[PDB]
Every structure is written in C-alpha cells, then in structure tokens.
C-alpha cells in the first residue's frame, strides 16, 4: 500500500517534472524576446518608422533606436544595461526610487524611479528624436505613453498611449489616431522654458502652439493627461534632461 503509493507518486512526479522543466527552460528565451518585441514595435511606431514583420522590427530597432539611462535629478546619462532596465520594477523598490510628496505628486504615481530610460532615434549617426516614456494616473488606471520630442527639446514629434484602461468611448480616445495627430508640432515649453503644454477643455484654438483638444465628455481623463505632462516636464521629471537637450545635447 504505502510502497505502491509512494512509487506511483514518485514515478508520476518525475515524468511530469521532466516535461514541465524542459518546456519552461527550452521556451524561456523565446518568451522574453516576445515581451521585448511587443514594446519595441510600439517604440518604432511612435518614432515614425514603418515595421511589419517581427524580423523587420528587430533589425530596425537595433539600427535606429539606442536606449540610454537618464538620471532624473541631474539630467545626465548613466551607464548601464538600458535594453534590460525595468523602470516600473525599479520604481517599486525603495533603494532605486523616491517617494513623492503631495505637492510633487501631480500625476498621482506616489513614487518615481531614480533613473529612467530614454530612446534616442538616430538617423545614421546623428540623433533626430528622443522618446520619453511618461505615465500618470487616469480615472480608472495608470496610463502609460511614449512622447517623441525633436532635438530642439521643445517640439513634440508624436505621442502614443500604449497602456490605458479608460472607458473605450470616454477616455479610451487617447488611442484615437485623430487625437494623437494633434500633438504633432506642439511646443512643450514657453519662451520662459516653463512647462506650457495645455489640454484645452471644449477644443483648443485651431492655430495654437501649446493647446491640444481635450477628450469629449472625458474631463477627468483629460485632467490625468494634463497632470501627467505637468509632472514629467517639471523639475521632478525630464525637466533638467530636456533643459540640457535644448542647450545642445544629444
């Protein structure tokens, strides 16, 4: 009884474990590249690069995009494994992130990683754009976006929200191509270099350097978008980094 019970359990466990372990280890490398290619495809899209096949995405990402670490406090580049840096995981660790106060936490993120990752879009050997990952709390969930900025450090080249959970008809319009097209050509800062991008409720004026139309019937999500850019363009975000970029960096 006991001998038969243990023999069956041990034999069954060994066979199951071997199949499970082989599948988990053999497929592990392909699993981690699928996660990478999902984000790499999104960064290529916001940068304005056409890529359809998985191989095409990999070759274009390596050729055109160079990830680099940036320290938020100083605005200087930091040496590290940029392609494998996880900013979200670093934001949840006390040794690699700072807790924000009520005054500073405009976007309601409650924490901020010490060092972030930016993506330099290079045409050959000269940087043409910089991709800044920003995030801020919406009405229902945290919203993550990529914003493409020209080398002048003021002009927006494109925007793409790649992770949001707002209502599809109200708030989910952050992914609407028509709304995203409005961000092209806008200026992030005024002549005093203060953050000046504004989400205008009821529709921005047609000729405007800083105004972007708000989401119809979605004032709360629009406030989340406005707070997101207010924080990340401030001194606590990419403020000093964009100040150095506009001075002749990159």
């Amino acid at each position: 009884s006991i001998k038969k019970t243990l023999f069956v359990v041990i034999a069954l466990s060994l066979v199951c474990s071997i199949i499970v372990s082989a599948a988990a280890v053999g497929l592990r490398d392909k699993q981690k590249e699928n996660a990478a290619l999902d984000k790499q495809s999104k960064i290529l899209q916001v940068a304005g690069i056409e890529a359809k096949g998985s191989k095409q995405i990999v070759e274009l990402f390596n050729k055109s995009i160079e990830p680099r670490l940036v320290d938020f406090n100083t605005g200087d580049f930091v040496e590290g494994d940029a392609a494998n840096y996880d900013q979200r995981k670093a934001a949840k660790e006390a040794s690699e992130s700072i807790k924000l106060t009520a005054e500073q936490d405009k976007a309601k993120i409650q924490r901020r990683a010490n060092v972030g990752v930016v993506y330099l879009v290079k045409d050959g050997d000269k940087t043409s754009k910089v991709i800044l990952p920003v995030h801020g709390n919406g009405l229902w969930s945290m919203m993550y976006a990529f914003v493409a900025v020209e080398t002048d450090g003021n002009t927006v080249s494109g925007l793409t929200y790649y992770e949001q959970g707002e209502t599809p008809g109200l708030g989910g319009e952050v992914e609407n191509p028509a709304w995203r097209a409005q961000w092209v050509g806008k200026k992030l800062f005024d002549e005093n270099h203060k953050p000046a991008i504004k989400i205008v409720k009821g529709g921005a004026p047609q000729g405007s350097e800083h105004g972007v139309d708000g989401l119809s019937g979605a004032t709360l999500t629009s406030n989340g978008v406005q707070n997101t850019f207010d924080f990340w363009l401030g001194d606590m975000g990419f403020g000093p980094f964009l100040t150095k970029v506009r001075d002749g960096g990159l």
């Binding site: 359990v9 466990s13 474990s17 071997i18 372990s21 082989a22 280890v25």
Partner: protein, 32 residues
C-alpha cells in the same frame, strides 16, 4: 541544465511532502 535539475527535484519534493503530510494526517486522525 541546473534549472531543469532543480525543477525536477523541487517538483518531486513538493508533491512528496504534500503526499506524506496527507498520509500522516489520515493515519493519525481517521479512526480504524
């Protein structure tokens, strides 16, 4: 293949521990 070997050992040991606990509990609780 250290991960595979560790996976095989831990998978067997976890199940064996669960089986032994149930058998010990049944022997010490269920009347006979």
């Amino acid at each position: 293949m250290s991960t595979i070997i560790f996976g095989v050992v831990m998978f067997t040991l976890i199940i064996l521990a669960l089986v032994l606990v149930i058998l010990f509990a049944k022997s010490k609780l269920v009347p006979t």
